Subunit: 482 residues, 4 copies
């Protein structure tokens, strides 16, 4: 399985990939480009790359949690298990760094050129930090020293703590992957952002906790510091760590100090720093929360806003209370607490989708009418698109006796009433339709129609009907029969 | 009253129901579907169901407050009154669980199918938790033991505390009911959300308070914990509870610690947990508050935003100060601090409503004119819709001498002035109208008209007039008389 | 000056009044309505009423600050100066209450009817609270007692503290006045709201401070409370008050406790209450601040948002970097970091204003052209409105050699260049104009035109020109000369 | 280099300047205006002025940090190094003040008039404060005294502290420069605002820290204050300062008190003040953070909001799940998680840019077609603009057998399929085009076309084609060949 590896290195055909590039042909074309250099180049959007980054993340998170703690609360830093772990981690990071040269960079089209583009762009931006993070600097220093001891040890811990610069790399990895996920799974951005922030906060809190003890460790546990003053120098490491974290955490969430307000200058300064870091983090969190909340009820909010405009309009015109109430009722019936521009949405969609939607809505309404049963399907489709949805309140005249009816109505739904002088009253319900006589007559409507309950009609204007006919002359002729 | 129960189980005809489904016929149809299975199925939107859920809520809230407190601050948990209360509660929850099988689930149309749909969908989602919550697990355990004592008792309390999982159920109930209420009463979403959050916070605070003491109780009141260190082990239960709540509450609202910063590890950890929980809750609350504030002054805000755009436009064109001032004045008069797209709003409404609105606005204006007194009502209605509202600043020429008047004006309101060379000056007020001579003439206007004070006209363009006439030829002919 | 008072009682002719009602005639009409009842009715929007409310506010604020403090930190509550002050205040509030019956209520049109409308609507809503607040209840109680002493005194303080219910009245007064001010002075809503909140917070803080000491006072200064534990029972009143306020204030802003965490139950409960009140207030403040911030940079924000959409569009089309840069540059030149729909704004304005704006913009541009010097002013005006503003980037062909020019260009501004094969190159600057030959020719354009620097043209389409001509045939004829 | 200075004083030709004024000619004109007065007037937007303000900022920031500290933590305020520094600073501020008279003020066009406009407008607004800040008042007072000592010294410090009023000036300088930068570099407003606030907070914190110690210093270190109670009167200055800052900083970020809750009244009051200042600042910061967060993910948010409307629409129409899924898929393919009104954006742009964009998009698509190879470039350009982008889901009929094709399709991209009864199946890919036969025929389409995979077409309607032809009759004729 030597070619398999190569294949993996190329960008695979996934849901994401298609969205990014297009069709499978496009993907293939991209792959061809990649295939110019053999075993030296890795495509950023590839599956192998993804796997590698996942691995890194798994390692990286652990390492970030571990490293500082290891440095602080374990005195014997030269013990076997620790050292082996460190070495392996370093190796992994070196490998990652190496990969980064071979990996392509997203911009615009992705640059797959190795010797000039990948090497120079990486070396001019992020390389140095990565290099620092990956390598075991402290160990190197120790080796150099080998080829005052307490002082050296103290120095070394600080050097080791340069391995926290992997965090930048981690962040970078996260960002790209999040972007990819957005393209793929349609994740809620707000949710993602807040989650990221939470993680960051946790990490920062941990670091602060470590640091608070770390400085004392560095300074040899002086008599006027928080570790010596609480009398927990020789206590179990875990307990100490917990205490430190608590101290840090309070500063993060604005609760208070540890045992006592700082005495030594250094300690005080550290506390202040933590507070600053804590405070800003909390602010950011609050902001994120606010954003999330706004996102969550957004549609609803929009509806309310829209309604407020109507209210304002009413106020401007100084309408009677009854009128206002009626309008409110209409709005409730008409839109059902929702906000959407129907027409705009339809425009945004393609034709087939639109047609499908219309069929779902109105095919049952128009098919029940005997005029459209014998007609051709295309004609029906054409008609249906034209139809315009309407609502009427109870005790409202839809059509009137003697007034010229510009449009005909199909009752999808609702309790209507046919007001006629000659024929008494024939109440109409869902499925019925009217204004049919006044289509090709081009005159005044005979009888009246009043809404008994709330109604949901589909209006069809005479002009629109004429337009529709314009395409189907045979159909028009047929209609003209009776 | 055996059939009455069945009826109740079906979905009733309410305001909500109509909105959900449609007309009474639709509701009846839905009921028919429900009526396929007798005494085994409950419709989610039914009145009986609503009542049941209300009952549950009444029970549930009480139980959530009570349970933890009971577990903690009362040592004798095997006493009669407590046990009876518990048993009844358990029974009620079991009944609720049973109902949940028989109750239909909202999706899309509601699934009323029992054997497959209701049983499998519920069992695959929420069942297990509900089952756990409902049953008295601790009591069962005790019974088993019956058919080291201190240890057993300690264990049992934890088991009992599994009955807090009713909270999920409660939440679910609340959400659905809130949704229903939205459909029904048009509640302010923001307000609802914040209220929910407040309740949650309170509950959480209470739980934290219980927990802080609870852990000490579990651990047998060790010498280095907050209960033993304050010397309030044998104090009255109520006082202790209050203290615990205070401790919890401080962490929630970021105030501080209890008597002293934690000493024992467990206590410290608990405190940290509380802080986390507290802090997040506070953040959420803040966010909600922000959202609410934004909602409350939204219309006003929108107006301001709109105005800012006008200002920006002015800036871009670098207008003189006087001009800007004039524009500002016009805006104030024109819109009166409000924001609304009139045309859009009108489009959103149905025809009858629109007509009514127009009548309310302009029937008094047009009726006072003697041209529209003898005319037909339909014609008048047609005319009125066409009319377009306008405002003019004082010292502004509305119509001019010698310039062709494209439109005529009805003064609804304001202090106008007729500038004529021959006839001196005849100042016009609310109710007057002009540009009437230049309607069918198709030429140049004779005299000028200047605004004395601010005005509110209803313009009527000649083209629009012609269009209107197009429908009523007789009317046009009549007009042509004089 | 008996009639003067009556006049004052009626609604005056102010800026506000006109905006509310309309013209002076409208105001007069309103006044007539008021004048139905003599010396018994007060119009809500009147000047006298405003004055009265200002007076009340002046009194009310003072009283709210004073009362609680007086109750708490002065033992001798039966001393002369205090009592006189109280009595006067009570009298004033009674007077205010009386006025409230006679004052009209805003709804819709304002209800000026006394016997039924004003009396019943007020008595069914706010009366009782107002009555309670106004009257000296404590004094009445004392009188009753006159016609254990320590106990009575304790009771009386609580009764007296019912006079804080004036706060509701104050709030009501503020709201109405704020609304009026909005109509009048165009105040920033956000700013207003935050200011209100600040005031409320301050008042609440003060009350909390009073309360914290007040409860101890009521309870006779027990040995385990914050006043007795700090050993400041017999200290100077002012100091005590300050301390109390500090204690309250910390809870409001989430800082901490007083000297020590509460010991007695009552104290603890009070603290908790304060924290709740404090915390909510702080949240509200934060929200308000956020809102204010959003308001302040709103225009700018909108522009950025708009730009982001353009960027997104570019991304979707996957444009080259150069192209993107060009677009960015164009946007910067075109809109200058601002957001406004020109056309929409113009539509919103009246005609005269629009004309004025156009003159300010383009009269200097078109007048310099010799074609429009001899023409009539009306024609010029007509032309100018039609003109459409445009921008061109340097190294861009505006007009081309051999391509049919649909529109002509007036260079308001910018460094243009005339590219001709025959006539070499004649560089054009601000004031010049071109495409003039291809107006009535209806053919292909001869020479090319390229932008040297950035340009700001006013395009005029041939169709639009034709339309303009349609009104002025003589003008057209004249133009046709040469 | 005497004229060089003059030149510098005039407004230079920068990117900013052009944007502000226009072309170089405009800038020159502006310069001419400036050149009316020689060596007495400075233009606000000039380079020299900018440099001066930068210098001031550099000085000013330092001075603000230094002054208070100097006043507080150094007893010997009459020492040489300090005094020299002070004197120089004072001189600089005096110079700045002088410049301010000579500098022009931005409004509208900038006022370059010296004797009336610059002198009176400055003297009526900001002068006095500036004068106070600039001059060494304390030193003057001392001199006066020269021409109880402890008391005098105490008084003098307060007087000296009047030199903090330079902050207003600094603020003013910052605002203007920020505005200029916005015009120039297109900075993110939100980011700027937050940065400003941070700086302010830091400064305020520092001042608070100084103040907390300062009051004690003024009051002669009484026995019941925080400096005397901690026993750090004779400690090193730096340590004291740090402690003070910590105390201040806690109040700012809501953490807690210093060593102990205040005892003396003055101290308590100071603490309260700090808390107020701190609390408000924190609120503001939170608000700013929220704003920033909203800005950052704005585009994404907008997309989500838009999508929610579609969902709402679907809900309203009660569509089947499959349909909804299809719609979602279409949206994902169609818009790719982005929001933009294409048409609106195009309208906003100029013609050349639009043309360029179209070429980038569709020239490759239309050029591959042999119909447009021999045609003229102008015609091609015209055609391309008309084209309308479309998407189709797999298993969707684009064109049908027997149905009249109103528009023709160019496959930019995607896996299509040609459904024919006679000719079997010929699958089409990127670059192909169809509906070409039904262009000038004006009849029914022969064969069907179904989407195999997702597609991205460019539709071209027959009406649009006809319109395009209308300009190029020769082209039309050519097309009519075959």
């Amino acid at each position: 399985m030597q070619r398999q590896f190569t294949s993996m290195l190329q960008p695979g055909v996934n849901k994401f990939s298609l969205r990014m590039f297009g069709s499978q042909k496009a993907v293939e074309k991209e792959q061809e480009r990649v295939k110019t250099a053999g075993f030296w180049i890795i495509h950023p959007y590839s599956d192998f790359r993804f796997y590698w980054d996942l691995i890194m993340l798994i390692m990286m998170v652990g390492n970030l949690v571990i490293i500082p703690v290891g440095i602080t609360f374990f005195t014997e830093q030269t013990t076997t298990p620790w050292i082996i772990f460190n070495v392996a981690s370093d190796t992994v990071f070196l490998l990652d760094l190496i990969m980064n040269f071979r990996t392509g960079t997203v911009n615009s089209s992705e640059i797959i050129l190795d010797p000039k583009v990948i090497k120079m762009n990486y070396l001019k931006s992020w390389f140095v930090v990565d290099f620092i993070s990956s390598i075991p600097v402290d160990y190197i220093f120790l080796i150099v020293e080998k080829g005052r001891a307490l002082r050296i040890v103290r120095f070394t811990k600080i050097l080791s703590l340069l391995r926290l610069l992997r965090l930048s790399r981690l962040i970078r990895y996260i960002h790209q992957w999040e972007e990819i996920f957005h393209m793929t799974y349609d994740l809620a951005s707000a949710v993602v952002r807040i989650f990221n922030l939470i993680g960051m906060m946790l990490l920062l809190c941990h670091w602060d906790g470590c640091l608070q003890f770390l400085v004392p460790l560095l300074q040899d546990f002086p008599p006027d510091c928080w570790v010596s003053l609480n009398e927990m120098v020789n206590d179990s490491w875990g307990k100490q760590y917990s205490y430190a974290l608590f101290k840090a955490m309070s500063h993060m969430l604005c609760i208070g100090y540890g045992a006592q307000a700082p005495v030594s200058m250094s300690d005080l300064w550290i506390t202040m720093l933590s507070m600053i870091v804590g405070a800003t983090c909390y602010a950011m969190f609050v902001g994120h929360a606010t954003a999330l909340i706004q996102s969550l009820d957004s549609s609803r909010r929009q509806y309310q806003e829209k309604y407020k405009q109507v209210e304002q309009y009413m106020s401007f015109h100084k309408l009677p209370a009854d009128m206002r109430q009626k309008i409110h009722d209409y709005y409730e019936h008409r839109y059902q607490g929702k906000i959407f521009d129907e027409e705009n949405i339809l425009n945004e969609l393609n034709d087939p989708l639109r047609e499908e939607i219309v069929n779902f809505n109105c095919r049952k309404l128009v098919a029940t009418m005997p005029l459209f049963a014998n007609a051709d399907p295309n004609f029906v489709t054409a008609m249906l698109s034209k139809l315009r949805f309407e609502v009427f309140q109870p005790g409202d005249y839809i059509i009137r006796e003697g007034a010229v009816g510009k449009k005909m109505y199909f009752i999808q739904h609702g309790v209507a009433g046919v007001i006629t002088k000659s024929s008494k009253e024939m109440k109409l319900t869902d499925g019925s339709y009217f204004g049919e006589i006044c289509l090709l007559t081009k005159g005044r409507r005979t009888a009246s129609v009043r809404a008994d309950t709330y109604c949901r009609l589909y209006s069809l204007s005479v002009d629109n009907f004429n337009e529709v006919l314009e395409e189907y002359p045979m159909m028009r002729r047929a209609f003209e029969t009776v």
